[PDB]
Structures are given as structure tokens and as C-alpha cells.
Amino acid sequence: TASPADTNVVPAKDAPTTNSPPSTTSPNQAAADANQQQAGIVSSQSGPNAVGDSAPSTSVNNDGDIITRPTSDSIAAVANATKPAAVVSDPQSM
Amino acid sequence: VNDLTRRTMTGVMTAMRQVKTMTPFYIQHMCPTELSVLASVTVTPPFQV
């Protein structure tokens, strides 16, 4: 009778962007389409509402850039690109 | 639409109009009571404009 599943419905974790497919071309439109198809709506019934919409995607950075890996790794990548040797061997060292 | 079809359509439409239904009564007099009650038990309260 008093089914909790019908009373305690709340958005799941990572809800706003979970369905976003991994792509770089048009992530927001692609994510929007994925949400629409995931929700069970078919394009033939949504009509004109499906053409211009866009939704948040994981491929888009908070700054508004196309990202292909977690931002920490991007930070790690640039950091690792610059690591001069701590101790070097040269004849004139005192 | 010849005459026979015209009457047939008219008969069908008036048939739809004449049949009794409780749905309008339920909506005007009963449904709001249920909605008000249900609005206080869900975790997510109603969001309206």
C-alpha cells in the first residue's frame, strides 16, 4: 500500500549530466537528445521541441571548454611537462 | 458528406454529449481534496507557477 518507492522520489546523484554521451562535436545538443530518448519520449511525438534544446554534459568544462579527461589530470599533465632535474652533474661545482 | 453521413456524424456527436460521466464532478469537487492531501506527504513538495 504505502510504497516508499512512490513517496521518497528524489533526483539521483549526478542527475544533471548522467546521460551525456562521450563526444566532442556538440556535447550539449547530444546530451539533450540522450535525455529526451532516455525519458522514453520519441522525436515523432515531441515535434518541434526537439530541435534547439541543449543540456549540460560532462565533456564541457565549468569554464566552458571541451574536455576529454578529468580536469585534475589536465592540471597534472601541464605540471609534469615542467620538472627540471633537482641534482645535475657538471664538472665545475665546488 | 452526403445526407446519410451527415446525420450519422450528428448522431454520434450528440451521443457523446449525452452520455453521463462523473469525471467533471470529480474534478470540481473531489480531486482538489486528494491533491491537497497528497501534496503534504511526498518528500518533494509541489513546485508551481
UniProtKB/Swiss-Prot annotation, chain A:
Low complexity bias: start-end ranges: 16-39
Function: Inner capsid protein that self-assembles to form an icosahedral capsid with a T=2 symmetry, which consists of 120 copies of VP2, with channels at each of its five-fold vertices. This capsid constitutes the innermost concentric layer of the viral mature particle.
Record protein name field: Inner capsid protein VP3
Assembly and interaction partners: Homodecamer; each decamer is made up of two conformers of VP2, called VP2A and VP2B. 12 homodecamers assemble to form an icosahedral capsid. Interacts with VP6.
Family: Belongs to the turreted BTV-fold inner capsid family.
Organism lineage: Viruses, Riboviria, Orthornavirae, Duplornaviricota, Resentoviricetes
Organism in which the protein naturally occurs: Aquareovirus C (isolate Golden shiner/USA/GSRV/1977) (AQRV-C)
Shown part of the complete sequence: 13 to 106 of 1214
Subcellular compartments: Virion
Region annotation Disordered: where it falls in the sequence: 1-68
